[PDB]
Structure 1
Amino acid sequence: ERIVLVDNKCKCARITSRIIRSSEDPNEDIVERNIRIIVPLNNRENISDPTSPLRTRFVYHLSDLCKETCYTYDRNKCYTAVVPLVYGGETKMVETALTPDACYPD
C-alpha cells in the first residue's frame, strides 16, 4: 500500500510514502513518508580503498539521492581493489575480493 519513490542502495535510503485512510468524514487523513535509512557505522570514507580511516560524518542529502562516493556496499555489484603481493624480490599486484557473496564465481 506504500509507493517506493526512491530506493538508493549506497545511501541505503528507502523513500516511500503512505496515506492512512480516514473514516467517513471530510478529508484530514495523514500523509506520511516511510523513509528508513540504514547506516553501516563501521565503513570507511573511500569504499573501494580498504586503507581508509573510519568515516564519522554521514551526509544524507535526501533531494540529491532522488536523482559522490557512496556509503554501504551493494551485494549485486563488486567493490574490489588491488593489493601488492611478494614472494621475494618480485612484487605482483593481485585483485582482491573485499566482500564475499558479491563477486563469488557464479
Structure 2
Amino acid sequence: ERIVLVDNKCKCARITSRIIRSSEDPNEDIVERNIRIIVPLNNRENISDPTSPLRTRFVYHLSDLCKKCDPTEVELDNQIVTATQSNICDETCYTYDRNKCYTAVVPLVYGGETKMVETALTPDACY
C-alpha cells in the first residue's frame, strides 16, 4: 500500500506515502512519509563530466522533487484540455539514471590523431 509519490531516479530520492491504519478511530491514522534517498559517495558534481570534482554537498529541495510539470488531461463537459498540476516550475542529477546512458568524450591520441571517442560512463546502460 506504499503509493509511489515520486520515483525520482536522477537524485535517487523515492518518496512514498501511506495511511497507517493504526487505531480504530479513523482520525489518528498517521499520514506517513517515506523519503528514501541514496547518496552517491563517489559521484562527481557533474556526472557527465568524469573529471569534475567530488560532490560533497548534497542538497535536496523536496518541493523540487515533488513537482509534477507534466500537464494532464481533464474531461470537462464539452472539452478535453491539458491541465497544469503545479505552480512551481515554468537539474543537478547527483546520481546516474539506470534508463539513461551517459557518455563522455575523451581525447585519444596515437600519432597525434586526437580521435575524440565517446566512452560509456555507465556501462550496462546502453551496452
Stretch moving more, 59-68 or 41-50: 59-68
Change in 2 beyond 3 A, CA 1:23/1:49: same
Q: Where does structure 1 lack aligned partners over 5 or more consecutive residues? A: none
> Offset at 1:25?
3.0
> Offset at 1:34?
1.2
Q: Where does structure 2 lack aligned partners over 5 or more consecutive residues? A: 69-91
Q: How many angstroms apart in 2 are the aligned matches of 1:25 and 1:45?
A: 49
State the Cα RMSD in Å.
Answer: 1.9
Q: How many angstroms apart in 1 are the aligned matches of 2:26 and 2:52?
A: 56
> Offset at 1:26?
5.4
Identity value in percent: 99
Stretch moving more, 45-54 or 61-70: 61-70
Aligned length: 104
Q: How many angstroms apart in 2 are the aligned matches of 1:22 and 1:89?
A: 70
Q: Which residue of 2 aligns with 1:22?
A: 22
**TM-score using structure 1 length:** 0.90
> Offset at 1:90?
1.9
Q: Which residue of 1 aligns with 2:85?
A: none
In the TM superposition, 1:84-103 aligns within 5 A as 84-103=107-126
Q: How many angstroms apart in 1 are the aligned matches of 2:111 and 2:26?
A: 80
The structure 1 segments of at least 4 consecutive aligned residues displaced by more than 4 Å after TM superposition are none
